[PDB]
């Protein structure tokens, strides 16, 4: 398993943007052009190039050789390279990617105060109860943990939000480990939270427990190679 991160301390220049556009498919280019907000374009762009860069290095291909598809729920894959399982998430200044020889999910979300209404309506009763147990001091932060942990799972599985959020329960324990309640039956999965930035909650979901201790940062320059 490898986890790479890109921190957007500044916006992409026009040069960088145009150079990054060089690596991607015509379809992906038109998609980036259809974004109303530039930063959404940049996040999607960077994520695409991150996968191209990591997998091209690993298989000794050129970046632009990689051909993406998606399965029925929109999960991206590389049909030519089915052993190269990956997943991307982006929010705010972060673009992050996970890579493994088995299916993998990752999520990061910028925290913003928010009501518990989304948790009440969508999360499992157990999670809602856990959430209500936190002091007001901590409920936003715990909501974003739950959100990113659950999303790491549904992204690993590949169905995303077609999988009801109340069909499984996650818990972040005081020692820092995550537990998941699944009908197993279900194959093993493991969730790790990462603290990469105090304004953000991030988690990764993988088929095995061999996670890296920290993530590897990647610069724009490395990606422009």
């Amino acid at each position: 398993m490898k986890i790479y991160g890109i921190y957007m301390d500044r916006p992409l220049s026009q040069e960088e943007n145009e150079r990054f556009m060089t690596f991607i498919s015509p379809e992906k280019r038109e998609k980036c052009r259809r974004f109303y907000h530039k930063e959404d374009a940049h996040r999607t762009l960077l994520g695409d190039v991150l996968v191209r860069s990591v997998i091209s290095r690993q298989y000794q291909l050129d970046k632009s050789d990689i051909r993406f598809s998606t399965q029925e729920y929109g999960k991206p894959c590389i049909p030519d390279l089915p052993d190269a399982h990956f997943n991307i998430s982006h929010s705010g200044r972060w673009v992050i990617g996970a890579f493994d020889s088995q299916p993998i999910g990752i999520d990061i979300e910028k925290t913003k105060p928010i009501s518990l209404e989304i948790a009440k309506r969508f999360f499992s009763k157990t999670e809602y109860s856990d959430l209500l147990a936190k002091d007001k001091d901590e409920q936003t932060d715990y909501f974003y943990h739950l959100w990113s942990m659950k999303e790491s799972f549904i992204k690993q599985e590949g169905k995303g939000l077609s999988l009801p959020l109340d069909s499984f329960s996650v818990r972040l324990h005081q020692d820092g480990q995550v537990s998941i309640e699944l009908p197993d039956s279900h194959s093993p999965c493991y969730i790790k939270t990462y603290e990469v930035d105090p304004g953000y909650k991030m988690a990764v979901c993988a088929a095995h427990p061999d996670f890296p201790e920290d993530i590897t940062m990647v610069s724009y320059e490395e990606l422009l190679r």
Partner: protein, 77 residues
């Protein structure tokens, strides 16, 4: 850009504008191209239930992420 043509489209536009912090959304605008993402899709679905007592499955919003489609779904229910 396509302006809303009925009360359900306009209301959904108001809901989307408020969730996304963007003004003047057309009814063919793709939710995910104009700032939408999963967390905000949940907020959209919560406010549709509050407004219309209609359960908006998330997979429906992702499958057809325009106000026109969503209005259709919401109206017929």
């Amino acid at each position: 850009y396509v302006a809303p043509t009925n009360a359900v489209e306009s209301k959904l536009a108001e809901i989307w504008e408020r969730v996304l912090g963007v003004s003047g959304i057309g009814i063919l605008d793709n939710f995910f191209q104009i700032g939408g993402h999963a967390l905000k899709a949940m907020a959209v679905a919560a406010q549709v239930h509050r407004e219309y007592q209609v359960e908006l499955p998330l997979k429906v919003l992702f499958a057809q992420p325009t106000i026109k489609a969503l209005a259709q779904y919401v109206a017929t229910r």
